[PDB]
């Protein structure tokens, strides 16, 4: 899984802002931190999100 | 999994428009840019979709 | 997993018409084209559907 | 998986009937007819249901 | 898997009383009979559970 | 997955206070007792949260 985990690589690399829809109807708009296998870190009061409840994601 | 990595293979390499119905409601009208085990990113602003909330693809 | 496998096979093969129930609410009506380990094909516009989206499958 | 696959073996062994509840919220009244990996068939017409959408299951 | 295996044996151990919240809002009040791999069977008629209709489980 | 392990162990190290939204809607206020590889464990009345259900989590 090359062209996603690369997003979320270069998008912790440069900060950048990011909107990220969950499952649930939570737009989380953040600076991404970090991610791992299961989960991302989301920079706001900090929102670790589990990469499940993940729908879809936007650099702003 | 041939039968649907054709499908995607397919149509990033015709760019056709396609709809895919998230399993929030979300209709997701754009050109399909790349697949990877986990999303497919869509162009109209760009949107990675996490393919495990994917409900279903239609070519339009 | 035969029993599942085996029904779609002998539905693709006799192009027999089916409702698919997805988790949304999502009634497809269709003929079942093609199926593989993540996804279904139907028949209407085509409306690649994730085999993770089902609920339930009828024979009309 | 013994103590569930036991008791839908010894369920369509009686032929005893059963509610299904869907995560849609579906009551799916019936007898079950097989079972396997990723289905359950009840039958009341027949509806095979995904077994991922299964919340809970009673005999009646 | 201990810590949350261990409970449920302790549960099942002691037929101590227990409500299981499913993520369908389904608040099953119950009395744990067993457990394994896929589901929960719980003592009200009985009702089994899919550990993946499982939200969160609270003793009474 | 080290970086989401390591921020529910320097948790329940602790005992910070945390918010867990899980996909029902849930805040789930409390502090972290222990983990495992499907649940959580809460404790504001003890709740232990399916891992499965979690949207995300904020220290607060």
Known sequence: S???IRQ???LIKQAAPVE???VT???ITGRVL???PTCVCIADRQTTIWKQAIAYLQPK
Chains 1, 2, 3, 4, 5, 6 share one sequence.
């Open 20 to 22: 990220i829809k969950l």
């Open 34 to 36: 970090w991610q791992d």
């Open 2 to 4: 090359l062209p996603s």
């Open 8 to 10: 979320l690589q270069n």
């Open 25 to 27: 109807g939570d737009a």
